[PDB]
């Protein structure tokens, strides 16, 4: 769905002889509140020894975008499980907000590389502040000064099954 980036905070268990377990937080892209609590215990089990029964969730917080209307260049690091052994991947996305770029990444991996939702691990999404270090090319061609291009051959969506004009393009 439309993803929402969340902040999930976890605290193992206040037990006798160890008060105050340390704390842990993560940034989770997910569709709703119920997934991102369960997606939190997916990663955080792999990093150290807790479980869902041995742990508890402190608080979740929805992080809205700091600047929606400003247009950003985003670099994403991706670890995905292919049919062979898994491997890294770095891709660059020119999009509007943080959580909208991950929307167009899961489409991009599914289209080109056939990776589903369950195979991909979003490593880190960072904003490239200055230009001219944009490494990929397809992001870079939109960065020239005074960019102008037409849209040739536009189609027209007709509501009637018959039209009498013998229609023409643009």
């Amino acid at each position: 769905a439309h993803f929402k980036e969340y902040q999930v905070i976890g605290r193992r268990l206040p037990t006798e002889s160890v008060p105050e377990p340390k704390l842990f937080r993560m940034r989770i892209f997910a569709s709703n509140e119920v997934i991102a609590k369960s997606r939190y215990w997916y990663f955080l089990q792999k990093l150290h020894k807790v479980k869902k029964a041995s742990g508890e969730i402190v608080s979740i917080n929805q992080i809205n975008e700091a600047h929606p209307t400003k247009v950003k260049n985003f670099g994403v690091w991706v670890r995905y499980d292919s049919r062979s052994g898994t491997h890294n991947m770095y891709k660059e996305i020119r999009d509007v907000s943080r959580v909208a770029a991950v929307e167009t990444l899961y489409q991009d991996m599914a289209a080109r590389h056939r990776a589903r939702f369950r195979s991909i691990h979003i490593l880190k999404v960072a904003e490239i502040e200055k230009t001219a270090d944009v490494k990929r090319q397809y992001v870079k061609q939109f960065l020239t000064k005074d960019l102008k291009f037409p849209l040739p051959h536009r189609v027209q969506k007709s509501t009637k099954t018959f039209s009498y004009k013998r229609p023409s393009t643009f």
Binding site: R94, V96, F142, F149, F170
Partner: protein, 137 residues
């Protein structure tokens, strides 16, 4: 007669300061200006004087109008509203024959049945002058 007669094939082209008209969605027939291009299909539009909020949209939902003006890329909404009024694009929109056609089919929707009857009587009186003005040449 010693020139290159190559045709122009002029086109409306997306750029910063290209004013657009939104056909489908929540907006539905309000002007807006392209603030900044994103990629092949998505652009960032705004019209403050029209009332459409600033948002990022796909170019399927919009159609390009041949009017332009100068606007610096990445401009904010308060910057756009001054350039919008200074070019007077809202006055320049109503000068077109395409803005008349939209208001023409709009006015035909809101006709009272008695007002629709008056169109009948006047179109009878009009054609009687035409058929005499014709067939004398």
């Amino acid at each position: 007669s010693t020139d290159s007669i190559v045709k122009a094939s002029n086109w409306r082209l997306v750029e910063v300061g290209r004013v657009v008209l939104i056909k489908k969605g929540q907006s539905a027939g309000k002007l807006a200006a392209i603030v900044e291009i994103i990629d092949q299909k998505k652009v960032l539009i705004d019209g403050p004087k029209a009332g459409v909020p600033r948002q990022a949209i796909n170019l399927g939902q919009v159609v390009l109008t041949p009017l332009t003006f100068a606007l610096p890329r990445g401009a904010r909404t308060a910057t756009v509203s001054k350039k919008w009024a200074a070019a007077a694009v809202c006055e320049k929109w109503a000068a077109s024959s395409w803005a008349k056609k939209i208001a023409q089919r709009e006015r035909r929707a809101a006709l009272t049945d008695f007002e629709r009857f008056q169109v009948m009587v006047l179109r009878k009186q009009k054609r009687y002058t035409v058929k005499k003005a014709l067939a004398k040449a």
